[PDB]
Amino acid sequence: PNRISPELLATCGYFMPRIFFLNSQYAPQVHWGDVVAALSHFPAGNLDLSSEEFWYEWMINWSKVGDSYINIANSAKSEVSHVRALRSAAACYHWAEFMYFSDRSRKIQLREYIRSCFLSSIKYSDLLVDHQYIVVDKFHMPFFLIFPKGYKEEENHPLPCVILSNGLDSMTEIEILSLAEFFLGKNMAVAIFDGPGQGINLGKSPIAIDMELYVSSIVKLLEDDARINSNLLCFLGISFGGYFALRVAQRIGDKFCCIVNLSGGPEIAEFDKLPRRLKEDFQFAFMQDNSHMQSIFDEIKLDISLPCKTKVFTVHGELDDIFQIDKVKKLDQLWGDNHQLLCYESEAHVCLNKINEYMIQVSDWVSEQFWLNGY
Amino acid sequence: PNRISPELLATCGYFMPRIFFLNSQYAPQVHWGDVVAALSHFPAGNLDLSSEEFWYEWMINWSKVGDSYINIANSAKSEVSHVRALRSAAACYHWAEFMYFSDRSRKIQLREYIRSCFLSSIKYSDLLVDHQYIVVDKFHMPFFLIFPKGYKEEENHPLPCVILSNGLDSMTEIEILSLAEFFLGKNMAVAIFDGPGQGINLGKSPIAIDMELYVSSIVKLLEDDARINSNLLCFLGISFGGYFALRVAQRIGDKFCCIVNLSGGPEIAEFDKLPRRLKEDFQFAFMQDNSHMQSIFDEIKLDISLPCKTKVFTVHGELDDIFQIDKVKKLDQLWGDNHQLLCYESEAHVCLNKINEYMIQVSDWVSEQFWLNGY
Predict the structure, then answer these.
(1) Contact B22 A31 (CB under 8 A)
(2) How far apart are CA A100 and CA A96, in angstroms?
(3) Considering only CB atoms, which chain A residues are within 8 Å of B85?
(4) What contacts B365, CB < 8 A, 6 or more positions away?
(5) CA B96 to chain centre
(6) Could you tell me which residue ranges the Peptidase S9 prolyl oligopeptidase catalytic domain spans (chains A, B) (predicted)?
(7) Is A73 exposed, middle or buried (0-12, 13-18, 19+ CB in 10 A)?
(8) What is the domain partition of chain A in residue ranges?
(9) Which CATH code, of 1.20.1440, 1.10.3470, 2.40.128, 3.30.70, is assigned to B6-121?
(10) What strands, in cross-sheet order, belong to the sheet with B258-262?
(11) Beta partners for B313?
(12) Which residues fall within 8 angstroms of residue A214, CB to CB, at 6 or more apart?
């Protein structure tokens, strides 16, 4: 009788709300049965979330479930069945790779699988997806402008647009598309992208600390696009993307009606004491070894005395062990009326037990900021 | 740090794939965080799935999460936020009630909450819902005819239609609407209904063993409806609804191109030895005490020598402890070429670890049967 062991389900408690994430219409999402398929035959005596051996077995077991869905997709008798299977495969391949850093080529291969599933699927979607490369100096940035259900240029005024950034270990068409659906559902356009070291670029180029440079290039594209009202822009970042949201607020905040920070902070906890696989996660994203990472963290740290140039909404957990709440509250106090803090008392990083609730509130808050700017 | 205890998550292993069910667009569905909200403060030393005390605490704790979503719904700043919250509340209230039988009025109240959320929400849906009462003698049967996304009479030929039946403890707009989306996605109409002792009628009227009488009245409505091709009908039943699917196959199978039996069987295991809360579940549905139930089970038992009058697809688990696999395999052998059996080796009742996979296969099989009948 196939089931997950209690020792394993307990061990993975922190990641279960991440793996299930948001109930979505378009974004790939696992079923409970996919988690059972992955973990039912997971080797015993292997329960250390900080161990390389754990995440190797995680990667190969989730890869098997992804493979099974590709086989279903290849044998599917309808386009609707084909796309459902491709979406399930993409979700499985994402959870295979997201905390696996030991084989750079294998991790990149798994993200290529996901992007292939996404690009293949767009054809069958009822949403208009405008996909292109934005050239930022010599960097060719993958970019997706997505319009709401049943959108037509001719029967619409220029739309508000939300730009959403990846965190360190998110995939654009998984977590970020999931968040983006809350804005698509409110008849807003969304802009999702792969900056350096983000999405398909993770393990190819180092993550850019100054991601606001790349966001500036997106803003210029949206200004030029007749379908988008560039006076009704929002920037949302999740996890390390929330750190980028705070940078955007300081540097190019005047371009935005409002900015959403989902559990980003102005500085990261001490690198050497980071729990789980976070050291290897940060190392992989920055393409740097252990010995260089604290120096990067010191460089990352924001000057919070530099003001944010727009309205900011931060969602943060009291028990966040990456972006410590004391630093976020200091920023909230100093940034004053322009910064609103929703703090969940017993929530860890990204408050994922509350994500349905807070994304309802966040999406209505963004709508309200556009309305305040005369939409 | 709010989380579910390992002892509880292990105990509930059987029900976790039921509670998460299918990733749906319209059907209410819980998030992982909803399960945490319900079970994080669940009283310790209370881990008996057969105990009345367990399901009381389950009901009050899930009721709290439902209440929280109604509060979000009442304060929602948009219609899209309002409907998302109503859907989340409905899912929570369903898991509060589905295995709770000790207060008839409270259980009926919770199903009224769900139906109120559903009827309130239809207004905001992009699907055409034709809701009415079908009069069967003196019984007024709640009935929902739902058309595919962007359906218009004038640009469509008469559609195929799938009639879906509840199991003993399902709710029409939760599990059955979830299944129905697989057929709506293939541009088929779906017919979902509350027969005696089903959906909103559970605890009001006893469940009708001869549910095919009520299905006959649906078939007549679909024959009369210009929008439906009554020569392209399917009947699907899940759990005890699958038992009804086998009855429909024997009595009025000629009305159907094909019938789907999701883990129904021709007879039930011995009543006195039923595990978990199944005795109280069957007692509540039939509105009968313990002493009368085995007699009803003896009456329920099908004459498998009576042939099925159409093509039948059964999905069954080898380890099903309600509809034993030996009885299903005997039926498969006797019904011969007209019956196909998909048997999952290590699956319990309804094979819920496989439901995404098998509903892809089932939906394509139904499409194929309509095609064979010249669609």
Answers:
(1) yes
(2) 7
(3) 360
(4) B258, B260, B313, B340
(5) 16
(6) 220-369
(7) buried
(8) 6-121, 126-372
(9) 1.20.1440
(10) B129-136, B139-146, B189-193, B159-165, B228-238, B258-262, B311-317, B339-344
(11) B260, B340
(12) A134, A136, A139, A141, A193, A195, A196, A208
Q: Write the DSSP string, A350-368.
A: GGGGGHHHHHHHHHHHHHH
Closest CA to B183 of B159, B214, B206, B207: B159
Helices (H), A206-263: 212-224, 240-251
Q: Do A363 and B37 touch (CB under 8 A)?
A: no
Number of other CB atoms surrounding residue B129 within 10 Å: 16
Name the nearest CA neighbour of A346 among B1, B333, B87, B226: B1
Whether the Cβ atoms of residue B313 and residue B260 lie closer than 8 Å to each other: yes
Gap between the Cα atoms of A198 and A191, Å rounded: 14
Chain A: closest CA distance from residue B233 (Å):
19
Structure tokens at A127: 């949403």
Closest by CA position to A177, among listed A127, A249, A228, A108? A127
B126-372 shares the fold of B6-121: no
At what resolution in Å was this solved? 1.5
* Cβ count within 10 A of residue A270: 9
Tell me the C-alpha distance between A211 and B209, whole Å: 65
> Distance between CA B265 and CA A360 in Å, rounded?
43
Q: Cα(B176)–Cα(B200) distance, rounded to whole angstroms? A: 13
Return the H-helix or E-strand segment holding A237: strand A228-238
Q: Rounded to whole angstroms, how far apart are CA atoms B333 and B318?
A: 16
Q: Return d(Cα B245, Cα B176) in angstroms, integer.
A: 14
- A4, A79, A353, A362: best mutation site toward chain B, by most B Cβ within 10 Å? A353
Distances (CA, A) of B281 to A332, B50, B52: 53, 11, 12
Chain A residues inside the 8 Å CB shell of B29: 23
What span, in angstroms and rounded, lies between the C-alpha atoms of B258 and B255? 9
The owner of tokens 């905040």 is A253
Distance CA B127, CA A44 (A): 48
Yes or no: say if A262 and A354 are a contact pair by the CB < 8 Å rule: no
Minimum distance, in Å, between the CA of residue B26 and any CA atom of chain A:
9
Q: Is B239 left (phi over 0), alpha (psi -120 to 50) or beta?
A: left
Minimum CA–CA partner of B75 in chain A:
A361
C-alpha span between A281 and A294 (Å, rounded):
14
Of the options 3.30.470.10, 3.30.2290.10, 3.40.50.1820, 3.40.50.2300, the CATH number for the domain spanning B126-372: 3.40.50.1820
Q: Give me the residues paired with residue B131 across strands.
A: B144
Q: Do the Cβ atoms of A353 and B32 come within 8 Å?
A: yes
Give A81→chain B minimum CA distance, Å.
6
| Burial class of B126 by CB neighbour count within 10 A (0 to 12, 13 to 18, 19+) | exposed
Q: How far apart are CA A295 and CA B340, in angstroms?
A: 64
